[PDB]
Structure formats: structure tokens, C-alpha cells
């Protein structure tokens, strides 16, 4: 009565689409310079990421001044002020969330947006395809428009210990409540991009009916989850004279300060993911998109785009039981029918797997998952973490 299917799907495809960073972000995380745009005459590269970066900010070297403070105007020499818009009046930047709801009060669909989307939608309305990137402080409910689209400027000539303006992107504790935003951050980020860290979970690879470990990973020392989320952001997908123009209050040259002009844009490809072990205090980073979670109570699955502190503890434990019990929609009880079971050898319910021997109750699974090993898998993890069909079953698929 119980036959097994040959079709090789994945129940995680829908859940894991927000961690496919190349698809859902389509630009760099650490340094984000994915789209080209005209500035006066020449062509320059600017932020194009389709998702928000929780905890990102520009650390200016040799500076007590914040990057969220306004750009240094005229008499403010050495460029030692910041990256945000000049503080002219404050009807475009900064804004309280209250004053965004007051300004766009009459509009229906703008009031339907969330706090991050509202700040961005506002910030990408000022005038070409050039728009200004924004920074939304959640703590203070403030919307900072950034004038300087650049992120890194840490070259070999003018930065090592010796007025020329140096900086890089980082995730320190002072930046944790900030949210870095390109002109393209989707208004539906909350249901399509990563924010929270996944508790009781490490990322993995679907190798025919069970989520397996990534073989090729970089181990590093991380004390807390913050240090792991910091390190991965430093490793993540990166898309990487003025003084006389700056002090004249030039609208166009200051807007393109430290911007590159010929395509080494990541498009979201890089060491974007990491698995943090709470017990060992090790952070395992890697540059292949994961295709599932392993349910391990000692792990936390994190990304460079994710927040440096927030953790969703509720693992999707029903995902396997739901997919097995949907795949019994040949009814459209068991007496007349026989059942073609799908290729899923892990479930919280043991009876649902229909394993040929005693399955493995995973001690470390919070969901109380049983895992059926005694069964011929039709796939393996080759070099570069590539899941591939085994030689024996190449011709059927």
C-alpha cells in the first residue's frame, strides 16, 4: 500500500526565499553600488539593494562626529561633519515618524506602508534614476536622508596614520537600532527580506528528504550573536580634489563624492550567511545560499542583512508533517487507495515518515524530530557545497 515517490522537491523553498540574497536583494550588503546613474554629466554607481540592512552605519575614522549628522557646508572644512542632508529647515530631512504621517496624511496607500517603507518612499521622491539613500533610526523614529551615497573610502594613499576624509561601513552597538536603505528597498520587506535571527536553527542544504550540514565553511571566534552578525557583515557581498568643490556648496560634485564610475558589482553574491554556536562560541560563515534549516537548540542562523540582536525562537516544526499530509491530496482513510509518499525522511510525527527501520530521534531537535537514515539517498554534496544528483540516478531526472 505504502509506495515511495521518485520526484525530488523541497518543502523549504517558500520559507527560504528571503535568505536567497542574490534573488531577493540583487546588490551588495557591506558596500551597495549596484545601479548606475548620471550625476551632472559622468556615470556613477549608487545603492540598489531591494532589502533593508539592520544595524549598518558608516564609521568615520578620526571623528567624534556621527555620519547621521549633516554634510559639512563651506566654512565646515576637513569634511568632518557627516553624510546626511544639510539642516536647512527640516520639512524633507530629518523627519519624525509623526511628521511623515502629518505630511502624507491625505494619501491612502502611503499611510498603509510600514515605518521603514514610509521613510524610504519619502526619501526616494527628491530630484535621471538617481535617488538619495536613507537611514531610519527605529529607537528615535527618525528618517535621515543621506547626501553622500558612498560607504567605504579606505585606500592605500590617503588614510593610514599621518583633512582627507576616511570611512568604512560596520555594525557596532551604537548603529544597532539604525536601518540602511537604498532607493529600491521593497515596501513588502517585512514578508520577503531577512530581519530576525532564527533561534533553534542553523542553515543547511536539502540532500534528498533531510536538511544536511554545509561541508565548506569558515570557522571564526564569536563571543555573542552580535560578534557573529558583525563578522559576517564584514565578509558579505561588497560592490567595491573634492575638498575645493565641497567648501563651494556644490550641489552635484558633493552628491557624487568618493563614488566609482567596468562591472564588479556582487549582485548579492558573497559570504552573506553564518551559523552561530552558543555553547562552542564559534561562528561558521559561508558563500552558498542555504536551502533549509537544521533544528539545533545550540545554533542561531544569521545574515549580514539581519538585525544584530532579535531572535525568532519559533522554528517551523509543522513544515514536514504539513507537506507529507498535503501530498495525501490523491483523495481530492486508506481502503480503496494506496499512498505514494513524498521524498521527506524527517518529521515531528514518527508514523508519518514510514521509515524502513527505527529512525533517529534527534536529541538536539526542539521540535522532537525523527530522522530516517536507512534509505538510499539519490543526491550528495559535491565541491563548492553543490547538491547534485548521484551518478546512479542521473538519467531518470
Amino acid at each position, epitope marked *: 500500500t505504502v509506495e515511495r515517490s521518485t520526484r525530488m522537491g523541497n518543502p523549504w523553498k517558500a520559507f527560504m526565499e528571503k535568505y536567497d540574497i542574490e534573488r531577493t536583494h540583487s546588490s551588495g550588503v557591506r558596500v551597495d553600488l549596484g545601479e548606475d546613474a548620471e550625476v551632472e554629466n559622468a556615470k556613477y554607481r549608487i545603492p540598489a539593494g531591494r532589502c533593508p540592512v539592520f544595524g549598518k552605519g558608516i564609521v568615520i575614522e578620526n571623528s567624534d562626529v556621527s555620519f547621521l549628522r549633516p554634510v559639512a557646508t563651506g566654512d565646515q572644512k576637513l569634511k568632518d561633519g557627516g553624510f546626511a542632508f544639510p539642516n536647512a529647515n527640516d520639512h524633507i530631512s530629518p523627519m519624525t515618524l509623526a511628521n511623515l504621517k502629518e505630511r502624507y496624511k491625505d494619501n491612502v496607500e502611503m499611510m498603509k506602508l510600514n515605518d521603514i517603507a514610509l521613510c524610504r518612499t519619502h526619501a526616494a521622491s527628491f530630484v535621471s534614476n538617481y535617488r538619495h539613500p536613507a537611514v531610519y533610526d527605529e529607537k528615535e523614529k527618525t528618517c535621515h536622508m543621506l547626501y553622500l551615497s558612498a560607504q567605504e573610502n579606505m585606500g592605500p594613499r590617503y588614510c593610514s596614520p599621518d583633512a582627507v576624509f576616511c570611512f568604512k561601513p560596520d555594525k557596532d552597538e551604537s548603529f544597532e537600532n539604525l536601518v540602511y536603505l537604498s532607493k529600491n528597498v521593497r515596501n513588502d520587506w517585512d514578508k520577503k527580506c531577512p530581519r530576525k535571527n532564527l533561534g533553534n536553527a542553523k542553515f543547511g542544504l536539502w540532500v534528498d528528504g533531510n536538511c544536511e550540514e554545509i561541508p565548506y565553511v569558515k570557522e571564526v571566534e564569536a563571543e555573542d550573536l552580535r560578534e557573529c552578525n558583525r563578522i559576517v557583515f564584514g565578509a558579505s557581498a561588497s560592490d567595491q580634489k573634492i575638498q575645493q568643490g565641497f567648501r563651494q556648496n556644490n550641489r552635484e560634485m558633493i552628491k557624487s563624492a568618493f563614488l566609482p564610475v567596468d562591472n564588479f558589482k556582487s549582485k548579492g553574491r558573497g559570504f552573506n550567511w553564518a551559523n552561530f554556536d552558543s555553547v562552542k562560541k564559534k561562528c561558521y560563515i559561508f558563500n552558498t545560499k542555504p536551502t533549509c534549516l537544521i533544528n539545533d537548540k545550540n545554533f542561531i542562523a544569521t545574515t549580514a542583512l539581519s538585525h544584530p540582536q532579535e531572535v525568532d525562537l519559533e522554528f517551523p516544526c509543522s513544515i514536514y508533517k504539513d507537506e507529507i499530509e498535503r501530498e495525501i491530496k490523491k483523495q481530492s482513510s486508506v481502503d480503496g487507495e494506496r499512498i505514494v509518499l513524498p521524498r521527506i525522511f524527517i518529521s515531528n510525527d514518527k508514523e508519518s515518515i514510514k521509515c*524502513p*527501520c*527505527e*529512525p*533517529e530521534r534527534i536529541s538536539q531537535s526542539t521540535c522532537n524530530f525523527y530522522v530516517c537514515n536507512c534509505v538510499e539517498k539519490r543526491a550528495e554534496i559535491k565541491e563548492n557545497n553543490q547538491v547534485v544528483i548521484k551518478e546512479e540516478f542521473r538519467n531518470y531526472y
Partner: antibody
Amino acid sequence: EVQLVESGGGLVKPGGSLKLSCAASGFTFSDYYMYWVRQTPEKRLEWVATINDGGTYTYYPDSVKGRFTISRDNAKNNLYLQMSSLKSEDTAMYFCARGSQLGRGEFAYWGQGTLVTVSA
Amino acid sequence: QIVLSQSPAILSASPGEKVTMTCRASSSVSYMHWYQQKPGSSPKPWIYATFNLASGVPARFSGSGSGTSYSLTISRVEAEDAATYYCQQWSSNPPTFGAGTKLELKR
């Protein structure tokens, strides 16, 4: 400790029938899978059948398809094996066996055994 | 049916010797379990899954391998090890065992 005790083996004519029994104790019988393993006079171990926790799914090799039928009385901790259309190739010492917390397809506990001789 | 080929069939060895016995699968396997059998009793689990020794077994015994080649390894034989040893897989269905390797001892 875990306790497996087989019984109900003997002489059977080639083509007839017999049922076996396997008493279980020192563990909650319903929480585990149960199996059947035979050994020939030539000393060749062969897996005979598998049954799951609740008796909802059984598994058997093509050497004893259709003839053999594994079953379990979880009410009073017993395992059985009906053996239709017997043959001299089925002549062996028969062993019931149990899995483990490790789920690697191992035979952790075995009974002493019960002998089925099939000659005319 | 995966065909496990145990070799040698008989292995005589004096007390003291490091002696090894082989097991060889037709198709590839994840890991191999091993069983000791003394005469007039059912086989007891000896090594679970290539390397991991079972409960109660002397640490003098050992195990190893990958894919198709696997191998039980005694470090120093004793008269109580005089028994027939069987390798078994259940990484592809149906599960299969080897023929056997009868450890004899010298005197």
C-alpha cells in the same frame, strides 16, 4: 535489562504453515520497531521482516514476499510471524530483534532464537 | 541486494597479535555495523556505524572504513575473542549481512 524470548518452532512439511511468538519485557514495547532475522545451517544471517511502532506499516524482502506476515500484540507485549507456503530454503534458527535510540539500521537486542526445520 | 564480501573466512592468530578482517560492499555504503557470535547463542552488536564501539565491548577492538572497504581491527587477541564476526549494512534497502570471519586462536 531488555528481554527477548522466542518460541513455537519445530518440524513442518514443505508447503504447509507455522506461526512464531517473541515475548518482550524490560522496555516500553510500543515505543520501538521490531524485526525478524534468520540464520541458515550454512551460517548466513538474513533479514526476514520489519514492523513499525503501531503495526501501520510492515516491510519484507522479495525472498519471503506474500508468504510471510509479521504482526504484534502491543496490548500484552508480543511479536509474531506467520509463515505460509513453507520450503526447505526457509529452514533456519529464527531471531526477533529491536532497534535503538541511534537510528542507523542496527540490531541492538536479539533473543536466544527458535528453530524451524522444514523437511518432508 | 548489496553483496557484502567478508575476507578471510578463517583467521588463526596467537594471543598478543594485532589482526584485521575485511568487509567489501558491491554498491557504496555510509557506514558498516559489526557483530560477534560465539557458538550456541545469537550474534551480539560489537561495532555500531564504522568506528563507534558498542556498550560492554573491550576497547582492544576497533573499526574503520569508507564507501565499500570496511575493517574490524583487534589490537591484542585473547582466547575470549574466539568467535565468528559478521559485518552488516542498512544504508540501502533491503539490509544485508556478510558470510562471516571465524577467528581461531593458536596454542
